[PDB]
């Protein structure tokens, strides 16, 4: 309403919002596409892969 200047580093143009990046979401799926116990029924072994996991 009041026009003013609206400008400071913080508390101007930093008081009402900021840049948003990430809301700490479920991307790793818990209880949708993992937390699974619904697997197949047949011949069996070796769905067991290994990455390097060095980073």
């Amino acid at each position: 309403m009041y026009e003013g200047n609206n400008m400071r580093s913080m508390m101007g143009t930093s008081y009402e919002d900021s840049r948003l990046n990430k809301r700490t979401e479920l991307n790793e799926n818990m209880s949708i596409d993992t937390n699974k116990s619904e697997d197949s029924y047949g011949v069996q072994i070796h769905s067991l892969s290994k990455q390097s996991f060095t980073g």
Binding site: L20, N21, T24, S37, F53, G55
Partner: protein, 386 residues
């Protein structure tokens, strides 16, 4: 005696003392009676070949409840109307009561603010280069500590909100809501009859007596089964899968497993009821072992404080803190969504870094506002052994 145990020529003697000696002449490294037995060469430095930094990001399982505010104001409020059954009209009464007033009565439960949570961390550029035999692994160290500083947000938020509805499932809702089971081979029939109670018009299954303006009265309501969830131990979901759906024949529309939020154990959390002060130094170290750096001696815990890890084994903390868990682990709390009011405000999540060059270590901060609450004006049934 041994040159390895001699700490006074290590790389920590030059960073606590302001003055140190500039050049060096080396050493005559040995492998005689160390942790570095070597058959062929007693005079070489132990070569390591790699390090790994294993790290997995962790979820929240509640991000479809993530409604977003704009962070203005601090009180919210909601209210229903009490139900009011009609009467038989008896004409022996006076002809003047139609002038008399009759206001409708309301519920009026009021909610305060949430809590803003925060965490900080410090990356050094000086001593960290003495480890990290390449340069990329230090960058992996940076992105790994950043990803754990966002994953812990998830695990603490799900743990605290799990704690809040389990804490609600004790000592808050009345005896017309709770029912008494006896076994895990019970409580599956009892949850199966407990569901499709709620699609009968009833006032026995809410808790509006715990509202402010509605202690006496009643309030009928229902639910819609795209809207209920059940909350239980993974043991019970294990029982439902291996026994109830497995050992029977035609359940082609009956298997209600899509509403089963289930956990390994329904408690790791602690709540202070008696107030006190902090005196033990190892208690301070144990708190900042989990990151609570702000705590000093002489500090004062409030009443409405949770603790989210096992903290009940300190001498300040015995007796006055309490674990929130079911007793006999035969536990099933069914509710309906629109009752739990989850909220967070996190657009200002990553604050700009502070550099501090004269110590040369950057420091970040993470802030987010979060508002847990649940609403009493819906349908809830708890199943336990008292």
């Amino acid at each position: 005696a041994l040159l390895v145990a001699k700490s006074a020529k290590s790389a920590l003697q030059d960073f606590n003392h302001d003055y140190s000696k500039s050049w060096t002449f080396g050493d005559k490294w040995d492998n005689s009676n160390t942790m570095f037995e070597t058959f062929v060469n007693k005079y070489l430095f132990p070569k390591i070949n790699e390090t790994l930094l294993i790290d997995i990001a962790l979820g929240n399982r509640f991000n479809w409840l993530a409604k977003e505010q704009d962070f203005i104001g601090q009180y919210s409020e909601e209210y229903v109307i009490m139900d009011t059954v009609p009467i038989n009209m008896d004409l022996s009464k006076n002809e003047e009561l139609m002038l008399k007033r009759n206001y409708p009565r309301m519920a009026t439960k009021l909610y305060g603010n949430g809590i803003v949570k925060k965490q900080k961390f410090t990356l050094n550029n000086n001593d960290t280069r003495f480890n990290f035999q390449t340069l990329a692994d230090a960058t992996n160290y940076a992105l790994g500590v950043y990803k754990k500083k966002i994953s812990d947000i998830n695990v603490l938020e799900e743990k605290e909100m799990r704690a809040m509805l389990v804490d609600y499932s004790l000592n808050q809702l009345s005896e017309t809501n709770v029912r008494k089971a006896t076994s895990k081979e019970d409580l599956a029939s009892k949850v199966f009859e407990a569901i499709l109670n709620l699609q009968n018009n009833s006032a026995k299954y809410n808790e509006v007596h715990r509202a402010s303006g509605g202690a006496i009265g009643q309030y009928t309501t229902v639910s819609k089964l795209k809207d209920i969830v059940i909350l239980t131990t993974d043991s019970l979901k294990s029982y439902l899968l291996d026994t109830k759906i497995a050992n029977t024949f035609q359940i082609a529309g009956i298997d209600f497993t899509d509403h089963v939020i289930s956990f390994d154990d329904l408690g790791g959390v602690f709540k202070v009821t008696k107030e006190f002060k902090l005196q033990n130094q190892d208690s301070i170290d144990f708190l900042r072992a989990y990151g609570d750096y702000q705590s000093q001696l002489g500090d004062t815990i409030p009443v409405g404080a949770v603790f989210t890890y096992d903290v009940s084994k300190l001498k300040e903390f015995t007796g006055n803190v309490e674990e929130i868990k079911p007793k006999s682990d035969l536990y099933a709390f069914i509710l309906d969504i629109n009752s739990i009011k989850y909220k967070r405000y996190t657009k200002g999540m990553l604050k700009p870094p502070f550099h501090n060059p004269e110590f040369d270590e950057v420091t970040h901060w993470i802030h987010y506002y979060s508002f847990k609450a649940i609403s009493p004006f819906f349908n809830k049934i708890l199943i336990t052994d008292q």
